[PDB]
Amino acid sequence: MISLIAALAVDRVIGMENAMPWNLPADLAWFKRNTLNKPVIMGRHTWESIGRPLPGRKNIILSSQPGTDDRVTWVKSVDEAIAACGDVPEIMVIGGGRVYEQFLPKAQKLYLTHIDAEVEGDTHFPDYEPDDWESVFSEFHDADAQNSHSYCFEILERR
Numbered sequence: 001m002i003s004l005i006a007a008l009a010v011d012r013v014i015g016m017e018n019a020m021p022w023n024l025p026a027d028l029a030w031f032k033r034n035t036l037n038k039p040v041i042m043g044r045h046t047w048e049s050i051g052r053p054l055p056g057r058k059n060i061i062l063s064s065q066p067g068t069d070d071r072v073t074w075v076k077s078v079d080e081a082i083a084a085c086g087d088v089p090e091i092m093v094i095g096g097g098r099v100y101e102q103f104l105p106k107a108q109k110l111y112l113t114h115i116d117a118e119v120e121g122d123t124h125f126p127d128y129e130p131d132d133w134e135s136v137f138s139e140f141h142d143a144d145a146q147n148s149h150s151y152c153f154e155i156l157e158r159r
């Protein structure tokens, strides 16, 4: 099974200038809980944005060019990325925009954080078709002293 996990600001914005400008510790904790002990697939730009391997996960990087770091696994196509995960119950696709576009048609589950924040971005999560997806979990949180925007954790499953 392939799942996508992402955090979306208003208008499906996910990034600006190869960064995420907000800081929501509760959402990073959600990301870690839902990805730990699973393979994670990311594009090269997202690898550069994170800047280090994510511990406790097999890190698989898509790039058309040879890898530059043997602490992670480098692959050159979607099918190779999936194969490199082996026989696991759930593969996590962690972006960015171009990678999400390619994996969306193959995904059964979306883990989405909806952040009540306006930021002028250059990368968006794919337009997906709402009729294709059932919301099976949602949990709303007001802003607090640690998290400066309200946010909603949602899990959707392909109908």
Ligand SMILES: NC(=O)c1ccc[n+]([C@@H]2O[C@H](COP(=O)([O-])OP(=O)(O)OC[C@H]3O[C@@H](n4cnc5c(N)ncnc54)[C@H](OP(=O)(O)O)[C@@H]3O)[C@@H](O)[C@H]2O)c1
Pocket: 005, 006, 007, 008, 013, 014, 015, 016, 017, 018, 019, 020, 042, 043, 044, 045, 046, 047, 049, 062, 063, 064, 065, 075, 076, 077, 078, 094, 095, 096, 097, 098, 099, 100, 102, 123
């Ligand atoms: N809010 C969130 O949830 C979230 C999550 C992830 C990322 N982000 C943000 O998203 C942005 C990065 O997204 P992006 O769309 O620019 O880049 P991306 O999807 O991270 O990376 C694209 C790169 O991945 C490689 N690639 C993708 N598909 C491939 C394929 N089929 N075969 C081979 N290589 C392939 C290519 O690398 P080469 O050029 O080396 O061939 C391509 O240039 C940043 O702003 C980041 O902060 C946000």
Ligand SMILES: Nc1nc(=O)c2nc(CNc3ccc(C(=O)N[C@@H](CCC(=O)O)C(=O)O)cc3)cnc2[nH]1
Pocket: 005, 006, 007, 020, 027, 028, 029, 030, 031, 032, 046, 049, 050, 054, 055, 094, 095, 112, 113
């Ligand atoms: N829900 C969600 N939120 C995100 O912010 C997110 N970000 C990315 C891409 N960017 C990043 C940037 C940093 C870390 C990161 O450092 N994660 C640590 C959390 C511990 C911490 O630094 O506070 C991790 O171990 O997973 C992960 C992804 C991909 N999917 C996401 N999915």
Ligand SMILES: [Mn+2]
Pocket: 077, 079
């Ligand atoms: Mn091929």
Ligand SMILES: [Mn+2]
Pocket: 086, 087
């Ligand atoms: Mn197999």
Ligand SMILES: [Mn+2]
Pocket: 116, 117, 118, 148, 149, 150
């Ligand atoms: Mn806000």
